Amino acid sequence: ESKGTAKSRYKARRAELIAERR
RNA sequence: GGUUCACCUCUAACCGGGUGAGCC
After folding, report:
1. What is the separation of C-alpha A13 from the centre of its chain, rounded to a whole number of angstroms?
2. What does the alpha-carbon distance between residue A6 and residue A22 come to, in Å, rounded to a whole number?
3. Which value, in Å, is the radius of gyration of the alpha carbons in chain A?
4. How many angstroms separate the CA of A11 from the C1' of B13?
5. CA of A20, C1' of B5: distance in angstroms
C-alpha cells in the first residue's frame, strides 16, 4: 500500500529475503 | 521551528531505531 517510503520498500525486501533466508 | 522529499535498518508483523537533502 501507497508508501513509496524506504520503510515499505525495505519490508518488501525483507519478504524477498524470507524466500532466501538460508 | 514549520514544511516537502529522498535513503537505511529491527520483525512474520505491529510497536520501534537511524540518516541524507531540499523548501520556507
Report:
1. 3
2. 24
3. 9
4. 10
5. 32
